[PDB]
């Protein structure tokens, strides 16, 4: 039973810095025919697999050039020259020269890019929610540069916890920003109960918190 | 134009039946073999099964004693079929085309879009939808209290696709799934344009199209 030991599981990488990708096998790939069957694919957010490189180091057509592959035996790698934004996503080695073939783990390439400040948005509940007895306040972090964020939610000046949940997307494929909503959850009565909603939020590139806020 | 789409059932409950559907197109399977892979929730790629284009399967270690791979060429569909389903299985399963080689394909050529199986003993639910109101304006829709995954959120029938950021779904501890789709748009165009998100929620065959209003 044949291992495929990929690393690392995340890789950081500046624009237009190089990628290496590591693949080791727990035996030889090598088929008796001869060839030794190792394909790579990239698996983009919300995405499908896709084929970059097979046969340790062929490109498939209309993948760049700055995608290769090398190796033999045990030892596999997966270099990519200057990384661009769209190469962002999950890396996977394929091993089928032995029944049964197997993936790696996977390699996540996280972009590094410029610092890059939130927009933040605040939605009050809607009136078709309130009129069936539960209000959602949502706060929204749009397109910002690195992951972390600090939001706080603030109700009458009173700091919330334990009644909120976030959600943040994967990296962008464009320009490699994250966005976040975080949303706090009450009863109609318990949210008709107070008067100033309040959506605090902490980040690298604010120069000190910005709150967004409404009155009920 | 060569195609492959996954067709499940949503959600199974455990130690019962699954029985997903790959219909093929562009391409003859007297002459592909086909994969199958699956990838349970924030996990690893995983190889499931493979039916050669002479009609002998092999399988995966794990899953074998409870997997069966079967075909018909002649109405172009692969057939997944597994039994005693446990919460393990939850996953998105893809079925992919063989390309190249003689008798072991150089690798996968094309994929399917995948088919969402939660293994679970809930029953479904439709999500309630919930605008989230509006030189830059972002607008929204609160899609909540729905089960299995997942929802499908559209902008204007497709048309309006720039600035969509639709969030991954959220577990609630009511057991029911909630996210929402936001998009920023111009301002200006407020009192212009209207603007109404397409929520399609397939286990519950629940179609929802909201208008959201300034
Ligand atoms: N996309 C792919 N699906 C599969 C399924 C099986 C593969 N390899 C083998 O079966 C190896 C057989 C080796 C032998 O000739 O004994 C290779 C493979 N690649």
């Known amino acids: 039973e044949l291992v495929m030991t990929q690393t690392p599981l995340s890789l950081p990488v500046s624009l237009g810095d190089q990628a290496s990708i590591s693949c080791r096998s727990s035996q030889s790939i090598v088929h008796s025919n001869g060839n030794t069957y190792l394909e790579w694919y990239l698996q983009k957010p919300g995405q499908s697999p896709k084929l970059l490189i097979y046969k340790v180091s062929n490109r498939f057509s209309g993948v760049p050039d700055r995608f290769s592959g090398s190796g033999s035996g045990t030892d596999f790698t997966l270099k990519i020259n200057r990384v661009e934004a769209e190469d962002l996503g999950v890396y996977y080695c394929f091993q089928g020269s032995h029944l049964p073939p197997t993936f790696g783990g996977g390699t996540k390439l996280e972009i590094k890019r410029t610092v890059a400040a939130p927009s933040v948005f605040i939605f009050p509940p809607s009136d078709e929610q309130l009129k069936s007895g539960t209000a959602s306040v949502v706060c929204l972090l749009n397109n910002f540069y690195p992951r972390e964020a600090k939001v706080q939610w603030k109700v009458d000046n009173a700091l919330q916890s334990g009644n909120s949940q976030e959600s943040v997307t994967e990296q962008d494929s464009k320009d490699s920003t994250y966005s976040l909503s975080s949303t706090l959850t009450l009863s109609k009565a318990d949210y008709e109960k107070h008067k100033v909603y309040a959506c605090e939020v902490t980040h690298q590139g604010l120069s000190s918190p910005v709150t967004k806020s409404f009155n009920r | 134009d060569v195609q492959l789409l996954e067709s499940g059932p949503g959600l199974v409950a455990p130690s019962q039946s699954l029985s997903i559907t790959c219909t093929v197109s562009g391409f003859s399977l007297t002459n592909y073999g086909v994969d199958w892979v699956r990838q349970p929730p924030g996990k690893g790629l995983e190889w499931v099964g493979v039916?050669?284009?002479?009609?002998?399967?092999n399988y995966n270690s794990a899953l074998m004693s409870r997997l069966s791979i079967s075909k018909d060429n002649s109405k172009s569909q692969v057939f997944l079929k597994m039994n005693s389903l446990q919460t393990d299985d939850t996953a998105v399963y893809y079925c992919?085309?063989?390309?190249?080689?003689?008798?072991?394909?150089?690798?996968?050529?094309?994929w399917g879009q995948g088919t969402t199986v939660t293994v679970s003993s809930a029953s479904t639910k439709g999500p309630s939808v919930f605008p989230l109101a509006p030189g830059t304006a972002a607008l929204g829709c609160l899609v909540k209290d729905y089960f299995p995954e997942p929802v499908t959120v559209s902008w204007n029938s497709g048309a309006l696709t720039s600035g969509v950021h639709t969030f991954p779904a959220v577990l609630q501890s009511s057991g029911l799934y909630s996210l929402s789709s936001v998009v920023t748009v111009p301002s200006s165009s407020l009192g212009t344009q209207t603007y109404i998100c397409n929520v399609n929620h397939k286990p519950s065959n629940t179609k929802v199209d909201k208008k959201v209003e300034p």
């Open positions: 992919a085309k063989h390309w190249g080689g003689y008798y072991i394909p150089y690798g996968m050529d094309h």
């Open positions: 039916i050669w284009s002479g009609g002998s399967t």
